[PDB]
Design an enzyme around this catalytic site. Structure first.
Site, PDB file in Angstrom:
ATOM      1  N   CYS A 130       3.868   1.323   9.269  1.00  0.00           N
ATOM      2  CA  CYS A 130       3.778   0.136   8.419  1.00  0.00           C
ATOM      3  C   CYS A 130       5.147  -0.277   7.878  1.00  0.00           C
ATOM      4  O   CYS A 130       5.994   0.542   7.550  1.00  0.00           O
ATOM      5  CB  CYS A 130       2.794   0.423   7.252  1.00  0.00           C
ATOM      6  SG  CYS A 130       1.129   0.459   7.871  1.00  0.00           S
TER       7      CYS A 130
ATOM      8  N   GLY B 285       2.837   5.939   9.521  1.00  0.00           N
ATOM      9  CA  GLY B 285       4.242   5.788   9.244  1.00  0.00           C
ATOM     10  C   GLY B 285       4.842   4.453   9.690  1.00  0.00           C
ATOM     11  O   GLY B 285       5.935   4.107   9.235  1.00  0.00           O
TER      12      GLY B 285
ATOM     13  N   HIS C 299       0.820  -1.208   0.000  1.00  0.00           N
ATOM     14  CA  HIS C 299       0.000   0.000   0.000  1.00  0.00           C
ATOM     15  C   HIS C 299       0.857   1.263   0.000  1.00  0.00           C
ATOM     16  O   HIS C 299       0.301   2.391  -0.066  1.00  0.00           O
ATOM     17  CB  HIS C 299      -1.026   0.142   1.145  1.00  0.00           C
ATOM     18  CG  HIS C 299      -0.464   0.127   2.541  1.00  0.00           C
ATOM     19  ND1 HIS C 299      -0.332   1.288   3.291  1.00  0.00           N
ATOM     20  CD2 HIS C 299      -0.213  -0.889   3.387  1.00  0.00           C
ATOM     21  CE1 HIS C 299       0.073   0.986   4.510  1.00  0.00           C
ATOM     22  NE2 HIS C 299       0.172  -0.329   4.596  1.00  0.00           N
TER      23      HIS C 299
END
Ligand SMILES: *[C@H](O)[C@H](C[C@@H]1CCNC1=O)NC(=O)[C@H](CC1CC1)NC(=O)OCc1cccc(F)c1
Ligand SMILES: *[C@H](O)[C@H](C[C@@H]1CCNC1=O)NC(=O)[C@H](CC1CC1)NC(=O)OCc1cccc(F)c1
Lengths: 306, 306
Positions: free
Chosen positions: A145, A143, A41
């Site tokens: 991930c 932030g 993503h």
């Protein structure tokens, strides 16, 4: 003595954290050999996120659209591919700090350390369990991930988790390092139910054994029970059923403490039916289920890694 | 979101752990520049420990009696000296992994990470508080002495603790890296009382603010109070008194959440007088005091180090 929710030393994983930027989105990647792994993503915009067609989205993108920074040196991207819910960015340069490593899909009820990162840099490390419902109860902001969860066996880092999203209930969901989610989740911004969660009975027992080992004995009682009789009370209380496999895994702790597993089941039973009367156990007013039998033995005999 | 007892990343401290052996005793030392720091009781035998004359004991010893091993390479010892309750062994070789560092004596109520070590190798990392009574509630076995507690400010490791002993109550006691004990303790095997401990009120408030920040609001009530009125109830419950210095330190959290500090004091008060009715807060059935205001802000805005 004493007993603490202890994380693994995190230095070998620190050497693998990089920053990955695509368009406006920045998150963390894991740089091992000449490959950076990160959540796919990273290629989405905030509109794309509501229902991304990932193959169409990745199609648009080229190697030079992926900015991968390791400290203040980034890497040239020569190759990109999508495996389940992770991107693999092939880079110019093998990470000179790559440790001996494995990719592992962990079982529910096992534990691992999380190195929470932002912008490719470590914020902190904590220990957690894969819930029976394939969620974790973490500490993740925007932030974070691409932050990873891991165990260490002497010199070998077993990567087992990459963080992707937060659920409506504030728990966390992610994949293994082949990009397959733990649990029924998808990487899109919709409402998603994790199942009913259940308590990791075998871990609660291991923690009561750690308690006895550390001199906390008040809850030990005068009853015994049977597996079938114990599980009748477990299911009332969403405890996952106890099996002889579990009894055998507690074997070493049972014999070290000289307390039959079914005698400790009997003590847990009276705790489940009678609460703690305002007592504590190893400093907790709750029955703690985030320590495996192996975690208890590790701690109490001083296992090291380096 | 979510809130976890998170340790600092530990890689920079891992690079500083060495094994120090004298006679039959082995424990950990901290290797920084050309100096290894370790607890002076490495020179004692199990008889010596009951009442060591350290100056007479150290006198016997020479540089070559100190075996200092860094991984599988040890160091040549060219110099030894005793500073309070630590030995400084001067070695041949400056540690090529020395980080930017400071030695700090921390205040009661501040927190730090502990890298528990055995034989010079890391076992794990956990976060803890310097209790008001200058003890810590750790996880330490034989061999763990010389393990160190630290904070990190971006690139700078502030060493604040070295582990020396366990008290009759199972808590832990140690020195700063100048070898002065926190609290009234001495390094001999006698019974030693830590004082009455007290709860770190300002940290409990910071944690209730972290709770509100993370959506856990049930305990918020409809009362307010005054400092003097709040402290009357604190002292009944061994809470350390709250001051305007503390109110000011909570200022940022108070204004972020829009909840007056004295309104949150009022909520804590009713919790202290009425318990939790079987509720939980951020997953705990107890009032948690091992997070400073600075720890809460750090976590909730994603501060990093690398
Ligand atoms: C990536 O860094 C981020 C980590 C999140 C951010 C807040 N806490 C976390 O753990 N992941 C996302 O932002 C994720 C986008 C990925 C799935 C495609 N979106 C997300 O976590 O949304 C939360 C949410 C909660 C309830 C309902 C809903 F529709 C979305
Ligand atoms: C060093 O590694 C060790 C760490 C201890 C071991 C068990 N848990 C720990 O934290 N320190 C010692 O072994 C220490 C010797 C130092 C003080 C000269 N002795 C010690 O901790 O004894 C415990 C104790 C408890 C009650 C009464 C008593 F007399 C001694």
């Amino acid at each position: 003595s004493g007993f603490r929710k202890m994380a693994f030393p995190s230095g070998k994983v620190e050497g693998c954290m990089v920053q990955v930027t695509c368009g406006t989105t920045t998150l963390n990647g894991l740089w091992l050999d000449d490959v950076v792994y990160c959540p796919r993503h990273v290629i989405c915009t905030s509109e794309d996120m509501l229902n991304p067609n990932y193959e169409d989205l990745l199609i648009r993108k080229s190697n030079h659209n992926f900015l991968v920074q390791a400290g203040n040196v980034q890497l040239r991207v020569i190759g990109h591919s999508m495996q389940n819910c992770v991107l693999k960015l092939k880079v110019d340069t093998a990470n000179p700090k790559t440790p001996k490593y494995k990719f592992v899909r962990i079982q529910p009820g096992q534990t691992f350390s999380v190195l929470a990162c932002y912008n490719g840099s470590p914020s902190g490390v904590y220990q957690c369990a894969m819930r029976p419902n394939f969620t974790i109860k973490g500490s993740f902001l925007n932030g974070s991930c691409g932050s990873v969860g891991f165990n260490i066996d002497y010199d070998c880092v077993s990567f087992c988790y990459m963080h992707h999203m937060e659920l409506p209930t504030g728990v966390h969901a992610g994949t293994d390092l082949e990009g397959n989610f733990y649990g029924p989740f998808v990487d899109r911004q919709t409402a998603q139910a994790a199942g009913t969660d259940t308590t990791i009975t075998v871990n609660v027992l291991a923690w009561l054994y750690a308690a006895v080992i550390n001199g906390d004995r008040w809850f030990l009682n005068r009853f015994t029970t049977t597996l079938n009789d114990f599980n009748l009370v477990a299911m009332k209380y969403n405890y996952e059923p106890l099996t002889q496999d579990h009894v055998d895994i507690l074997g070493p702790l049972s014999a070290q403490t000289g307390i039959a597993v079914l005698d400790m089941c009997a003590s847990l039973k009276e705790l489940l039916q009678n609460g703690m009367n305002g007592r504590t156990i190893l400093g907790s007013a709750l029955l703690e289920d985030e320590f495996t039998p192996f975690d208890v033995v590790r701690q109490c005999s001083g296992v090291t890694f380096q």
